[PDB]
């Protein structure tokens, strides 16, 4: 078993914040092999951070990823309500991949 | 681009075989790789199985509480990419997820949509 655990679990945001969850491993892997997920309540992990600081087709550019380590976080810049996901992290470096407790956004 | 498209879901009586399919299109990735991650509200998400191409044939790699139980299996002639559970128990209920990624140096996975598959007695 490797570990990615995600501060914190549930957030509040009043649209117009700037929010950031982080997420760690247990053993240092390398940046570019964590990649962020969003879901949205009713669908699939919808693919949107790739790389440490990738953003995939789409995702808004008010968005922020970056981190070498052991920690790696989000941000968003000014929260809107289509953000309100639950977000995950994701580990590709070494089997077996494991991912985040994920946490979840809601908007205040 | 893509279009994933997975089917065969539904649920067996525990103990049930099955074989959850998705077919690739756009692609003909000279070389990609692909794995079935699944989803249930106990477990949150978790990488299942994966077969891989990075152009020799079949090599695949599974997990603590997968092995023995499912086999990844696809070939590109076609299209196809077949994943059979056996044995299955409660504990692997959920909705899985068929996504394929290529080996380009940069760019980003893709995914489906899923379906659901219940190991009921019922």
């Known amino acids: 078993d490797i570990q990615l655990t995600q501060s914190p679990a549930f957030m509040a945001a009043s649209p117009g914040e700037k929010v950031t969850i982080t997420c760690s491993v247990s053993?240092?892997?390398?940046?570019?092999?964590l990649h962020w997920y969003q879901q949205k309540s009713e669908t699939s992990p919808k693919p949107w951070i790739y790389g440490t600081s990738n953003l995939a087709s789409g995702v808004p550019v008010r968005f922020s990823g970056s981190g070498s380590g052991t920690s790696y976080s989000l941000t968003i810049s000014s929260m809107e309500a289509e953000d309100a996901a639950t977000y995950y992290c994701?580990?590709?470096?070494?089997?077996?991949?494991?991912f985040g407790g994920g946490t979840k956004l809601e908007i205040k | 681009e893509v279009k994933l498209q997975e089917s065969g879901g539904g649920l067996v009586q525990p103990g049930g075989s099955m074989k959850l399919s998705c077919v690739a299109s756009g692609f003909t990735f000279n070389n990609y790789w692909m794995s079935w991650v699944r989803q249930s509200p106990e477990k949150g998400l978790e990488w299942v199985a994966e077969?891989?191409?990075?152009?020799?044939?079949?090599?695949?790699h599974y997990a603590e509480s997968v092995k023995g139980k499912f086999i990844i299996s696809r070939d590109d002639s076609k299209s196809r990419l077949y994943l059979q559970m056996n044995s299955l128990r409660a504990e692997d209920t959920g909705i899985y997820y068929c996504v394929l990624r290529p080996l380009f140096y940069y760019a980003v996975d893709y995914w489906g949509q899923g379906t659901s598959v219940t190991v009921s007695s019922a």
């Open positions: 053993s240092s892997i390398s940046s570019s092999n």
């Open positions: 994701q580990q590709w470096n070494s089997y077996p991949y494991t």
């Open positions: 077969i891989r191409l990075n152009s020799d044939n079949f090599a695949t």
